[PDB]
Symmetry: C3
Subunit: 335 residues, 3 copies
Amino acid sequence: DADKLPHTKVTLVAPPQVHPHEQATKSGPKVVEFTMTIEEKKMVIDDKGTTLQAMTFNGSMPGPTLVVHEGDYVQLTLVNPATNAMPHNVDFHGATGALGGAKLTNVNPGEQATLRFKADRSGTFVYHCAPEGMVPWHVVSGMSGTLMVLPRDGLKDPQGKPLHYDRAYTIGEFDLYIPKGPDGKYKDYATLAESYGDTVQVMRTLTPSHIVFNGKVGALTGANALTAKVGETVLLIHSQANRDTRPHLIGGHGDWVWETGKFANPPQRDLETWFIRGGSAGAALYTFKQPGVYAYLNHNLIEAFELGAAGQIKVEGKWNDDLMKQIKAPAPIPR
Amino acid sequence: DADKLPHTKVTLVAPPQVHPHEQATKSGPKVVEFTMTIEEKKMVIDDKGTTLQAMTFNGSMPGPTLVVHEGDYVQLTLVNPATNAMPHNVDFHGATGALGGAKLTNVNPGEQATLRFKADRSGTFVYHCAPEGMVPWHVVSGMSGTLMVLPRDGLKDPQGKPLHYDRAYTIGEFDLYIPKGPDGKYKDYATLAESYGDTVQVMRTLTPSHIVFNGKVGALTGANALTAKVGETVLLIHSQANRDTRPHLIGGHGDWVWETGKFANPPQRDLETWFIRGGSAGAALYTFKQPGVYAYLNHNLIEAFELGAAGQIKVEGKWNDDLMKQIKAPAPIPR
Amino acid sequence: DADKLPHTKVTLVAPPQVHPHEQATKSGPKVVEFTMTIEEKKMVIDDKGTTLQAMTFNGSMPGPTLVVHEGDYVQLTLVNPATNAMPHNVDFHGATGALGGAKLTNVNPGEQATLRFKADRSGTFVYHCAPEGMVPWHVVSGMSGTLMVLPRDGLKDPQGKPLHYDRAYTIGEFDLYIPKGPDGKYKDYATLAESYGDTVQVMRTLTPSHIVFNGKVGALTGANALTAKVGETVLLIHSQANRDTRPHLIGGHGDWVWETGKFANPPQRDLETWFIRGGSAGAALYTFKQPGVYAYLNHNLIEAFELGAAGQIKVEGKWNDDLMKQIKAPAPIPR
Ligand SMILES: [Cu+2]
Ligand SMILES: [Cu+2]
Ligand SMILES: [Cu+2]
Ligand SMILES: [Cu+2]
Ligand SMILES: [Cu+2]
Ligand SMILES: [Cu+2]
Ligand SMILES: [Zn+2]
Ligand SMILES: [Zn+2]
Ligand SMILES: [Zn+2]
């Protein structure tokens, strides 16, 4: 009975980081309490100044990742401040009943609600806004993130051996549908409401104008690159609430991957590219063996390089000539 | 030798139901006899009166689901009445040889044929029309369905334990390519033949005008919703003969899913969203734990909510506060 | 230490064949040496004379398949002749570090380089060109192929039993983005450089003009069909470096399939249709049981029949009435 369990309070952090948590734990079930505040805002999503009339959990695309253990209860307070214009709610794919909690969390600007559900299944799960009659619009405008439900005894390989990560990153991939006017330039809207009609028209073509990681072209590149070092194991959580994607680490692999994102199933090993179904989150582990800059991208290369679905991981450490060596550098072809 | 085996005759039923059958059986192999009659007809496929010049097995999209056991022989009589205009045939993905039976079942209006094949592999398999030179047109116009070949000892989990369903539903998802005229309104054609050229042009864009379950927007919503009760296990068979889809039960899960649809492989558990490859049928089991209206949809939410790929399941029973509880209903934010 | 190992030299062959190699081997690790020469050339890609300003490894789309065993080192000499116009490189998904080798193999026309890497993971892996700032263009213009890294003790089924193939074929599937002029006819460009801008514009629509196997509509049909006989096991290697596809053998199955292409994972059996993620290569085994012409195609049937993604396998041997029989040929419907 959930009423009798101990409560904990978790402080969320902004993507691409994930809040501190244990993997395997000696702890028993708890009611883990979280709070999120919705923020509607205009965001610049590319390097030429295009804006999106966006909608977010906690001010970020994606929303923050929530981490619990299997058998915990998630207790979320969702706040919709009066400065917003639209009603919102939340649908947790990790939850059972009431359209994922959406029917129980309908909040108009100025309102809040608290939902509890039992996280009875391990895996990474999408959560997203789903207001009746406007579901796709709120999702493509930015209202999604991940709930990770870890097995109480941590991650396991196909033979039941322990797996772990030393750091976790969360990447949300967003297919955007920005309208254009008769001059072929992207439209800039004064309000969220004014963007709706034109956006629906672009959506129905099924062709995104942009496909971005974490809300913007280059959000995870250069100074914003993810980091690691040789010998460190990273967990890359990848969510796509609306459209398929195919993650790939250039120069690396998915050592252990749950592409459907559900940890009670055996992972696959040695993947070059994996597949995240629209409406899901998946998870890959990789242990770095070489230093350098890696590209982490959607391997539809047009979607990555032209539309925005690409980031970087900068890795410290010692180069390994056994794994790879330039035997002969570029030089004139012998005559 | 199939000539010496007992024959049975099966009476088909209209989707979304599936004809009565056993799962695990003490019965030995049989020749199971079915009949289907092709019907070409104009169908209304949305709520604004758009029509499709359609082609069907047995008058429905999808055609009916045929169920046998592994080691049975399927013996189909395919009838193409003289009231039709086009030649047709059938390609069973569950069969071996002769382009799935298509080369042996070419029937002009006024003709019929009978094919037998050994169902030697367990799983859900697409069948579809495939006339030489017009294959995509007959498929996208509605000529597909599912053959389910159950293991003789029923479904099994990854550890070899028994799985079962208490009721089965069949959902065919159809990407449609309806042409428009210069006024931007959908075209209405007097005959099937007259729709061909314009439709091919839309097909080649790869952008469906509509994506529907069971032949129409809302075919499985409201009064037409699927039904179940708390404690009942449902099998959802999902076929897509031409294009990928990603099924999801909102408020629920895929407890056990064969997304590639082949029962000799272990199922995955706890899925939020699964993936049906274009040209295949998959199968998910779920046991209801909460009452209420569930949405069952393609989780490209634009494809679901804008284009039509969404239905409902209405579930009777008792609400379970342990699984989910509204701790605080929507109410003003405390000052 | 790779410096002390024996070297071998492998002579590559043109797709759809694969160079002679052993599956299970008693041999220890070697440094396997290969050479490829890049050729830019204009190619005719359909039956109406459309051209592509193409880029290739070794003159073919796809490039040749390279085969080694797990624990071998691949040592590639990449040659970019002075007759070419563009810089090139190579990214092996089977390799670890330096963006797959791309950072170490940047070759201008008139240059060459030699890369070595350890093939420490079994599976079929894409390799492709990836010059900074032009990655998608070189890939969609034809610069991809497969590296197959076989387990030293050969392929294995889910229970660890031996699997084998008697012949191997390699199929590269290419989504092409050919521009059109104001008359609606495809453009013919005098040089590779002149095709770039217009092609990028088509790419960004995400709609291919053509999707072809092995560089052209019909490249694997008719006189160019693959061949086999009843009782022979074929391995079909299928690569797609940019876009998802869904292979299917009409009249057959994937007996054992590694759709993510990585041999340390158990294969799935009895597939009707499998899924190759954009940016990967997969592998299917099938043992023929019936003679005849089979179609091997992408089962988005519009992509196959309208856009080009279809071939044939012509199979010799004896028809098997137990597997399939025409009980009654097409004939008038009884009155
Ligand atoms: Cu919202
Ligand atoms: Cu959802
Ligand atoms: Cu037909
Ligand atoms: Cu088919
Ligand atoms: Cu190149
Ligand atoms: Cu790549
Ligand atoms: Zn570690
Ligand atoms: Zn039951
Ligand atoms: Zn053999």
